[PDB]
From a paper:
Human DGCR8 is composed of an N-terminal region that is required for nuclear localization, a central heme-binding domain (HBD, residues 276–498), two double-stranded RNA-binding domains (dsRBDs, residues 500–700) and a C-terminal tail (CTT, residues 701–751). The HBD is a dimer and each HBD dimer binds one heme molecule. The HBD coordinates the heme Fe(III) using two thiol/thiolate groups from the highly-conserved Cys352 residues contributed by both subunits. The dimerization domain is an integral part of the heme-binding domain in human DGCR8; it aligns residues important for heme-binding in proper spatial positions.
We present the crystal structure of the frog (X. laevis) DGCR8 dimerization domain. Crystallographic refinement was performed using a model containing DGCR8 residues 300–355 and water molecules, and resulted in final R and Rfree factors of 0.2068 and 0.2280, respectively. Thus, our crystals contained the dimerization domain generated through degradation of the HBD. The frog dimerization domain crystal contains a single polypeptide chain in the asymmetric unit. The chain forms a dimer via a crystallographic twofold symmetry. After strand β3, the polypeptide chain extends through a hinge loop into a fourth β-strand (β4) that interacts with the WW motif of the partner subunit, forming a continuous β-sheet and resulting in an apparently domain-swapped dimer. All DGCR8 residues known to be important for heme binding, including Pro351, Cys352 and Trp329, cluster on a common surface. The dimerization domain structure of frog DGCR8 is very similar to that of human DGCR8 with some differences at the N- and C-termini. In the structural superimposition, the side chain of frog Cys354 points toward a direction distinct from that of human Cys352, as supported by a relatively weak but substantial electron density. Overall, the high degree of sequence and structural conservation suggests that frog DGCR8 uses the same mechanism of dimerization to aid heme binding as identified in human DGCR8.
Residue numbers in the entry:
A (entry chain A), B (entry chain A): 300 to 355
Write the structure that this text describes.
Amino acid sequence: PPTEPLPDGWIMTFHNSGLPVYLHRETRVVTWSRPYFLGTGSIRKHDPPISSIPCL
Amino acid sequence: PPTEPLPDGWIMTFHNSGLPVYLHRETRVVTWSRPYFLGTGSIRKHDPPISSIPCL
């Protein structure tokens, strides 16, 4: 399956460590795992998109 | 150093897989790594808080 697009307001860049980081520009919030839109999906039970799964 | 608080609008819960997930309630956006407020820090050069570093 293709990489899911980022949700609105987010951008992917690369940190000097060589790892990608994801910035929500307006809130200045960063995460080191690709964020995605859950929508009406179940937070506890949904299957995450492959591009967003962390190690494990 | 203590765990950094989540930014506004975010909540940590646990996915059925046993891993934590972080939900921004209003946008329905999820990430699997703890988000944090970067503020005036440099996106490329800042040192991330320990609780937000992914595997590696």
